[PDB]
Design a protein around this ligand. Structure first.
Ligand SMILES: Cc1cc2nc3c(=O)[nH]c(=O)nc-3n(C[C@H](O)[C@H](O)[C@H](O)COP(=O)(O)O)c2cc1C
Lengths: 128, 115
């Protein structure tokens, strides 16, 4: 959610109608992303600029975050392996690549794969 | 652990990132709410008010015939949990909840809140 407008049908209870269900009204709404640009969040200048310029995507196509960048946003896994929704910056996409290549591997294949990529790994750190 | 450790704080301090390159940085955001996020550096009071205010118009139109006179009113708003002259003598057995509702009054005012 981001505006009063898209949020309204969930207040009327009219949203649930698209699915042939009785009107199903809600009591309130929370806005997480929508506020990240506000004059008073500590989000850095260049970062607010980055956030805006992300084209969104309808609920129609959010599933694609799992694979490609989708509206400028990918999922990426934390150190613990739980999914995280991040802006698809260069660093984040490296993090995603390592997520798929290096961190992916069994703890047995770790140290060998690192050494065979040491030059590459060390380079991509320094760049992105 | 060296890679992913403590990696949320750069979004807010790019002066300490390699060369202030946001493109190196973890920023969190939703794919669907991203489309509604456009107006940079807009005061938070505005964003929130923008939503409430907009809900208020749509609501007025639909169920109030755009007449603000039709909106019922009350002294102060809130304090509701999701669930002319008299004398109350009190005993051991008097229900506390019932008792206060009496002294509270039905009209929402200073005496209602006082009890
Ligand atoms: C940058 C960022 C940091 C967040 N930190 C927390 C947190 O510390 N605890 C929590 O229960 N939810 C946290 N959330 C989840 C939001 O509070 C909320 O559930 C979600 O952002 C709403 O989705 P939306 O941004 O698409 O409106 C965070 C979301 C974002 C984008």
């Amino acid at each position: 959610f981001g505006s009063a407008d898209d949020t309204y049908p969930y207040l009327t209870g009219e949203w649930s109608t698209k699915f042939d269900y009785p009107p199903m009204p809600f009591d309130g709404f929370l806005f997480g992303s929508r506020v990240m640009i506000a004059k008073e969040v500590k989000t850095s200048p260049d970062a607010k600029k980055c956030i805006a310029a992300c084209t969104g995507v309808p609920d129609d196509k959010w599933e694609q975050t799992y694979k490609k960048p989708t509206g400028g946003i990918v999922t990426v896994r934390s150190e613990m392996g739980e999914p995280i929704h991040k802006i698809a910056t260069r660093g984040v996409m490296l993090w995603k690549e390592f997520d798929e290549t290096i961190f992916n591997l069994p703890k047995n294949k770790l140290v060998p794969t690192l050494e065979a990529k040491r030059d590459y790994i060390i380079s991509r750190l320094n760049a992105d | 652990i060296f890679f992913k450790k403590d990696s949320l704080w750069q979004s807010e301090h790019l002066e300490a990132v390699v060369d202030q390159d946001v493109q190196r940085t973890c920023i969190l955001h939703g794919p669907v709410a991203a489309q509604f996020t456009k107006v940079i550096d807009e005061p938070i009071k505005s964003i929130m008010d923008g939503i409430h205010d907009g809900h208020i118009k749509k609501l007025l139109h639909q169920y109030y015939g755009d007449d603000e006179s039709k909106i019922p009113a009350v002294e102060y708003f809130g304090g509701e949990s999701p669930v002319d002259s008299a004398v109350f003598k009190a005993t051991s057995s008097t229900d506390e909840e019932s008792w206060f509702k009496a002294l509270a009054g039905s009209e929402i005012n200073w005496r209602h809140a006082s009890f």
